[PDB]
A paper describes a structure:
β2-microglobulin (β2m) and its truncated variant ΔΝ6 are co-deposited in amyloid fibrils in the joints, causing the disorder dialysis-related amyloidosis (DRA). We show that the aggregation of each variant in vitro results in fibrils that are polymorphic, which contain different numbers of protofilaments and different numbers of β2m subunits per layer of the amyloid fibril structure. High resolution structures, however, show that this polymorphism arises from the assembly of a common building block that is strikingly homogeneous and monomorphic.
CryoEM images revealed that the gross morphology of β2m-[name] fibrils is very different to those of β2m-ΔN6 and β2m-D76N fibrils, with the dominant fibril form being thicker and less overtly twisted. Subsequent 3D classifications revealed that 69% of the fibril segments selected correspond to a new polymorph containing four protofilaments (i.e. four β2m-[name] monomers per layer of the amyloid structure). The cryoEM density was of sufficient quality to build an atomic model for residues 21–84 of each chain. The fibril has C2 symmetry, with all four subunits per molecular layer adopting a near-identical conformation, but is packed as a dimer of dimers, with the dimer formed from protofilaments #1 and #2 being identical to that formed by protofilaments #3 and #4. Each protofilament has disordered N- and C-termini, with only residues N21-H84 being sufficiently ordered to build an atomic model. However, it is clear from an examination of the low-resolution density at the periphery of the map, that the termini are in an ‘up’ conformation, and indeed there would not be enough room to accommodate the termini in a ‘down’ conformation in the densely-packed [name] structure.
Author numbering:
A (entry chain A), B (entry chain E), C (entry chain I), D (entry chain B), E (entry chain F), F (entry chain J), ...: 21 to 84
């Protein structure tokens, strides 16, 4: 029994990025850009008035 | 029994980034950029008034 | 029985970044950038008024 | 002079079972089943009345 | 002069079972089943009345 | 002069079971099952009445 | 700022002369001539009257 | 700021002369001539009257 | 700030001459000539009257 | 100056006999017969009356 | 100056006999017969009357 | 100056006989027969009357 109550945010999965995986007899390889990401900022605010009012209840029950 | 009550933030998983994994007889390889990320900042605020009011209850029960 | 009540922050997992894993007879390899990240700052604030008011209860019960 | 008087039972010969003999650059190979046999039972009897009356004379002669 | 008077039972010969003999650059090889056999039971009887009356004369002669 | 008067039972011969004989650059090899056999029981009887009456004369002669 | 005031003479660049780079299974390779040059003589004069009167002002300025 | 006021003479650059870089299984390799040059003579004069009158002012300035 | 006022003469750079870099299983390699140069003579004069009158002012200035 | 006055007998030259010279990924090779010759007998006589009468003069002159 | 006055007999030269010279990933090789010769008998006579009468003069002169 | 006055008999030269000279990843090699010769008998006579009458003069002169 798999129960997921709440999931959010950056969660990519099962991603494969490859270049010349089984390359044979290749010549010069230059300026290969395989960068996945640059910056990870969950809260990025400029001159912001951040006032969230949330009453949240997380209740997930597995009865057997 | 797998129960996930709350999950958030940066959590990528099962990611493979490779270059010339089984390369044979390759010539000069230059300027390969495989950087995954640069900066990890959960809270990044500039001139911000950060006033969040949250009443949150995390209650997940597994009854057997 | 796996129960996760609350998970957050930077937690990537199962990530493989490799270059020329089983390379044979390769020539000059120069300027390979495999940096994972630069800076880890959970709270990064500039001229910020940080006033969060949170009443949070973390209650997860496993009854057997 | 090759003389065979009596031959019986399980005697297979000159059998070759192979998979990917000279395989190269294969990413995944999973759940390969090359089992030759499971159980060798010459007499397997359930609720059996086994009463065979046999008189046998194995007489093979090589005269030179 | 080769003379075989009586041969029986389990006697397989000249059998070759192979997988990836000269394999190169294989990323994953999982759950390979090359089991030859499980159980060797010449007499396996359940609730059996085994009463065989046999008179056998194994007489093979090589005269030179 | 090769003379075999009586041969029986479990006697396999000249069998080769192999996996990745000359393997190179393999990342993972898991759960490889090359078991030849499990149990060797010549007489395996359950609730059996074993009463075989046999008179055997094994007489093989090489005359030179 | 790249400024070149005067450049002359023999200055070839970025030249690649190659033969059988990744050659395989070659029976014979004979009399391969890859000579780049023979003689470097800036002044080579025979029975010459060399009388050049030159006034040169090499003035190149980078103002920031 | 790169400033070159005067450059002359023999100055080749970035030259690659190669033969059978990754050669395999070659039976014979004979009389391979990869000579780059033979003689370096800046002034080579035979029965020469060398009388050059030159006034040169090499003045290159980088002002910051 | 890189400033070169005067450069001359024999100054080649970044030159790579190679033969059979990663060679394998070669039966014969004979009479390989990789000579770079033979003779370095800046002034080589035969029956020469060398009378050059030159006034040179090498003045290159870096002002910060 | 090459002078051959008398040449006779078995003298073959420059003969190449090969099988699978640069073979790759070949299966079983069996019963390869590359025998050059069996028997070398210059004089082989059976019940022979061998009576040769020869007056032979071998005179070859190289005058320089 | 090469002068050959008399040459005879078994003198083969420059003969190459090879099997799988640069073989890679070959399977079982069996019963390879590369025998050059069996028997060397210059005089082989059976019930022979060998009576050769020869007056032979070997005179080769190199005058310089 | 090379002068050969008389040459005879068994004199083969420059003969190469090889099997799997640079073999890689080969399986079982069995019953390889590379025998050069068996028996060397210059005079082999059976019931022979050997009566050769030869007056031979070997005179080769090199005059300089």
């Amino acid at each position: 029994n798999f129960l997921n109550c709440y999931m959010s945010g950056f969660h990519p999965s099962d991603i494969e990025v490859d270049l010349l995986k089984n390359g044979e007899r290749i010549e010069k390889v230059e300026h290969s850009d395989l960068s996945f990401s640059k910056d990870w900022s969950f809260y990025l605010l400029y001159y912001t008035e951040f006032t969230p009012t949330e009453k949240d209840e997380y209740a997930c029950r597995v009865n057997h």
